[PDB]
Amino acid sequence: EFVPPPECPVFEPSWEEFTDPLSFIGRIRPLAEKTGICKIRPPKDWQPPFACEVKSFRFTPRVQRLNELEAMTAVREYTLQSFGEMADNFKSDYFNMPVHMVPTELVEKEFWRLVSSIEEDVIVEYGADISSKDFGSGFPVKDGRRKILPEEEEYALSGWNLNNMPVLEQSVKVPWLYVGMCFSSFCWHIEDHWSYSINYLHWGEPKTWYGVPSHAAEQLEEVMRELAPELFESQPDLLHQLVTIMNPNVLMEHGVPVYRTNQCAGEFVVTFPRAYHSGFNQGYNFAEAVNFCT
Numbered sequence: 001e002f003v004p005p006p007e008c009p010v011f012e013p014s015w016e017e018f019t020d021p022l023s024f025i026g027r028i029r030p031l032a033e034k035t036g037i038c039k040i041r042p043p044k045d046w047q048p049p050f051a052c053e054v055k056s057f058r059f060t061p062r063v064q065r066l067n068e069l070e071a072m073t074a075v076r077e078y079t080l081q082s083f084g085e086m087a088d089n090f091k092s093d094y095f096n097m098p099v100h101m102v103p104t105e106l107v108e109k110e111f112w113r114l115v116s117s118i119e120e121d122v123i124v125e126y127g128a129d130i131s132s133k134d135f136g137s138g139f140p141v142k143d144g145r146r147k148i149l150p151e152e153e154e155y156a157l158s159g160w161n162l163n164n165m166p167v168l169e170q171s172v173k174v175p176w177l178y179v180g181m182c183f184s185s186f187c188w189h190i191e192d193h194w195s196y197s198i199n200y201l202h203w204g205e206p207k208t209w210y211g212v213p214s215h216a217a218e219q220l221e222e223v224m225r226e227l228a229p230e231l232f233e234s235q236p237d238l239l240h241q242l243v244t245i246m247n248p249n250v251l252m253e254h255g256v257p258v259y260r261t262n263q264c265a266g267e268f269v270v271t272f273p274r275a276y277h278s279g280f281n282q283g284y285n286f287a288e289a290v291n292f293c294t
């Protein structure tokens with residue numbers, strides 16, 4: 001009986017507020033940093049075209065056994081089309097209904113049941129951490145060769161184009177792509193150097209997020225230590241974060257505030273410094289994310 005955490009803030013900026021992302025994120029900070037994550041819906045007329053080269057898009061996704069931790073105590077290469085056919089067939093077969101008729105709350109409850117289920121073993125695939133320099137960004141970009149339409153030049157130059165976010169930390173990186181299917185997931189983690197993260201869902205079924213404000217980060221880590229497997233106890237956080245899957249209700253019952261959201265196609269998710277987050281994909285989708293500073 002999974003209990004959905006409360007919803008994180010959703011913002012719908014005006015065209016005036018949408019001109020500068022860093023300025024806008026700095027304005028919503030008093031609320032959003034208290035929830036860890038937030039969702040941003042661009043103006044409805046803001047519709048960037050999908051600019052990846054679909055034909056030559058080939059990848060070998062990683063395999064994910066949902067209950068791999070609870071179990072402690074054949075490989076395929078795809079195109080985008082063939083991955084979507086596999087993904088929709090899996091979800092359609094699993095729930096015995098068309099993929100868009102499956103309620104997000106049902107996939108959510110079934111996902112967390114499967115993670116803790118030793119009785120039935122479900123295995124999915126995730127085209128995660130695909131570099132945009134080997135594959136091309138989902139956003140249109142100007143590089144002198146590879147070449148764009150007049151109507152999409154505004155999106156190649158927009159500040160909300162993830163290729164235009166500031167990434168150089170200050171002292172004395174390109175976006176990553178994520179091809180998801182139903183139940184493909186990412187576990188609890190923060191960004192390197194506690195940086196911001198922003199994620200854009202180009203198309204497909206929603207991506208479900210869970211977020212924890214930065215002030216509760218040490219409390220989550222303490223809950224992790226006490227309940228994570230004893231073999232992974234002494235591991236440094238960079239490695240422990242590879243297998244820190246935990247039901248959000250477990251965190252909530254220990255006093256850790258958790259917020260959720262369904263990131264739909266065309267929407268941004270922003271994670272704030274040291275805001276722990278995790279999630280799963282409701283179905284076949286395509287996301288793009290980058291770490292940005294200030």
Ligand SMILES: O=C(O)CCC(=O)C(=O)O
Pocket residue numbers: 128178185186197198199207271287289290
């Ligand atoms: O979509 C994913 O699998 C991970 C995304 C993420 O970690 C981020 O956008 O910060």
Ligand SMILES: [Mn+2]
Pocket residue numbers: 189190191197271277
């Ligand atoms: Mn992240």
